[PDB]
């Protein structure tokens, strides 16, 4: 029972500045070090820092060490890092994770032990508008699935950045869902589907929305998908 | 940065090992190196750590070692479920860490699986807007390498495509989708429009028509 929620997906303009943030739950703030990592697309970890939550104390890699600040908020138990300069090379996944105990004796900082990692915050740097998503029911079809079972879906057209996320009746329904990987089209922007196999006899009285959320530019949608008629 | 392998292959039940290569400075002169495990999709999980131990709930198929300025990651009884990017994490110096590029693990004598494809056409709603969009979700498919084309009535379309690469599932197996980006007049115009999908020698073909 540890968890750690980072703040949400960021689009930022070549230049510009990056606050990310991160709240551990389910154990003591102080005791152990905070560490920050990213992914960029196509490679792998990269270290960027560690940060001591009790003293506030940081020390940052060679690559990073003028563009990374790295703070906490004791009164609430939230760890921030801030980088700053951004270009297409800042574009990744960042990752904070928790370190080794925190002692007097001996120091643990540059223990590369992470036992609990956040669920990752995208961040996109370009110069490209944020476009919002138009969102499309995919009327249940029967034709393709395994027996007394239809499909139906959302199609989540021309968006940028990545990413958003799909859930089902406000998370009621997790069943049967497959949210496909995005496409990256010509046109410079994303689309994807989700598609949720649901039982043939329950449509009519059972009710499928989906909820798209895309929080770089601000977007919820709602949609109904229900049968269609000919 | 540590050098890892890119990709390291195995047969299932054989025993596989990850190279992990930096200094003497890190992992020559130090026990602190830690392994990490990502799923396609997922955040990493902590496998090994002090080049030896492991966490509570890893599997014991998992074993660390190192001999000079190489650290290595050992699974024993391999599986289909450790078929995954891996990780290695040093002491780097200066209260530093390091990380390695990461490799993958594929798992040889892994069978085949068909292609599940599903067909939808442009929805009313879409066509209001005066906009058209098919929709090919390609599913279960094994290996991940497919092929998908597009038909108006019986001839090839190519204008307007767009089709994703294939990516791993979290049962082992690959997913893709296809999109046909079409004008409500050329939805209408015609008889109807198909998604055919080339998986290894075999090939599905769905179809759907105007209303």
């Known amino acids: 029972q540890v968890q750690l929620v980072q703040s949400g997906a960021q689009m930022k303009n070549p230049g510009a500045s990056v606050k990310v943030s991160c709240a551990p739950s389910?154990?003591?703030?102080?005791?152990?070090?905070i560490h920050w990592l990213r992914q960029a697309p196509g490679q792998g970890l990269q270290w960027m820092g560690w940060?001591?939550?009790?003293?506030?104390?940081?020390n940052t890699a060679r690559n990073f060490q003028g563009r990374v600040t790295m703070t906490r908020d004791t009164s609430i138990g939230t760890a921030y890092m801030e980088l700053r300069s951004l270009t297409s090379d800042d574009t990744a996944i960042y990752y904070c994770?928790?370190?080794?105990?925190?002692?007097?004796?001996?120091?643990?900082?540059?223990?590369?032990?992470?036992?609990?990692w956040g669920q990752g915050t995208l961040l996109t740097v370009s110069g490209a508008s944020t476009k919002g998503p138009s969102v499309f029911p995919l009327a249940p079809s029967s034709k393709s699935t395994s027996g007394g079972t239809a499909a139906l879906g959302c199609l989540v057209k021309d968006y940028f950045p990545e990413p958003v996320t799909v859930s089902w009746n406000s998370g009621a329904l997790t069943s049967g869902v497959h949210t496909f990987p995005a496409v990256l089209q010509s046109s410079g922007l994303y689309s994807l589907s989700s598609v949720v196999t649901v039982p043939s006899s329950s449509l009519g009285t059972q009710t499928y929305i989906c909820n798209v959320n895309h929080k770089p530019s601000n977007t919820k949608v709602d949609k109904r998908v229900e049968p269609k008629s000919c | 940065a540590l050098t890892q392998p890119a990709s390291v292959s195995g047969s299932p039940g054989q025993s596989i090992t990850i190279s992990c290569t930096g200094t003497k400075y890190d992992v020559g002169s130090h026990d602190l190196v830690s392994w990490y495990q990502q799923y396609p999709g997922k955040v990493p999980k902590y496998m090994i750590y002090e080049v030896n131990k492991r966490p509570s709930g890893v599997s014991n198929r998992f074993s660390g070692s190192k001999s000079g300025n190489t650290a290595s990651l050992t699974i024993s009884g391999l599986r289909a479920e450790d078929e995954a990017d891996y990780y290695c994490c040093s002491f780097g110096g200066s209260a530093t860490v390091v990380c390695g590029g990461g490799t993958k693990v594929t798992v040889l004598g892994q069978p085949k699986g068909a292609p599940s494809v599903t067909l939808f056409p442009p929805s009313s709603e879409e066509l209001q807007a005066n906009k058209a969009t098919l929709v090919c979700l390609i599913s279960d498919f094994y290996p991940g390498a497919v092929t998908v084309a597009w038909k108006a009535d019986s001839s090839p379309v190519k204008a307007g495509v767009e089709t994703t690469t294939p990516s791993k599932q979290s049962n082992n197996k690959y997913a893709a989708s296809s999109y046909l980006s079409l004008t409500p007049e050329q939805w209408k115009s015609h008889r109807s429009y198909s998604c055919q999908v080339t998986h290894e020698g075999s090939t599905v073909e769905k179809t759907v028509a105007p209303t």
């Open positions: 994770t928790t370190g080794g105990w925190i002692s007097l004796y001996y120091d643990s900082s540059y223990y590369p032990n992470f036992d609990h």
């Open positions: 940060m001591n939550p009790q003293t506030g104390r940081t």
């Open positions: 389910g154990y003591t703030f102080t005791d152990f070090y």
